[PDB]
Ligand binder design. Structure first.
Ligand code: FES
Ligand code: MG
Length: 215
């Protein structure tokens, strides 16, 4: 709300109307939202979009944990690979992110897309609340794993020197405490991307065949 200031952010579905987005689960509607998000079909069970790997994101953290091989393959392709399963969860999450962002950025003490520099990499905080001279980071949980977003937020906390951060779920909010141990994940990722050889698969079955085997 313009003119007011925010103490703490509220759950996504308590700010945006999530029910409006539950009618987005047919091929016809998918193929239209796909076009806009610049997401395309590559293989019958694989979608993709362009991704800048100078940019750290929950996408990368989620993928580093799932399968370091997948992260390397994607870095080489210059493409982010999405399973035909969770392509709708990404598109839905992106629209939810955009609405929640634009609505909370309306507060006087709230700001969207705060660019931060992590050395050779860059980060973009979903939302930043300014309680006094301190910047409280906010991470919107959409599309990827709970742990991925939570780690990402712990990085932004440790970079902004905040005392804590907010992790906004659909129907609740979580106060993530500063944990500099999450920054250790950042050194490992920087190593996987620069690795001249592909790491070993840390998954039970590749849902992205045959791409992973062919690099
Ligand atoms: S996803 Fe683990 S190797 Fe293809
Ligand atoms: Mg987020």
């Amino acid at each position: 709300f313009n003119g007011m200031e925010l103490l703490s952010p509220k759950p996504l579905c308590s700010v945006v109307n999530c029910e409006d987005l539950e009618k987005l689960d047919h091929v016809s509607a998918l193929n239209e939202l796909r076009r806009e998000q610049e997401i395309f079909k590559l293989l019958p069970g694989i979608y993709a979009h362009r991704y800048d790997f100078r940019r750290v994101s929950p996408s990368i953290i989620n993928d580093f944990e799932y399968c370091p091989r997948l992260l390397w393959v994607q870095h080489k392709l210059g493409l982010k690979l999405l399973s035909e399963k969770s392509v709708v969860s990404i598109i839905r999450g992106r629209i939810l992110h955009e609405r929640y962002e634009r609505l909370l950025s309306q507060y006087e003490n709230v700001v969207a897309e705060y660019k931060v520099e992590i050395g050779d990499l860059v980060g973009v905080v979903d939302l930043v609340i300014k309680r006094g001279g301190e910047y409280i980071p906010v991470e919107i949980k959409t599309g990827f794993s709970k742990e991925a977003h939570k780690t990402q937020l712990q990085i932004y906390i440790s970079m902004l020197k905040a005392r804590f951060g907010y992790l906004v779920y659909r129907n609740h909010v979580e106060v993530v405490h500063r944990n500099d141990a999450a920054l250790d994940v950042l050194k490992k990722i920087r190593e996987i991307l620069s690795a001249r050889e592909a790491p070993p698969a840390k998954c039970n079955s590749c849902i992205f065949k045959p791409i992973c085997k062919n690099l």
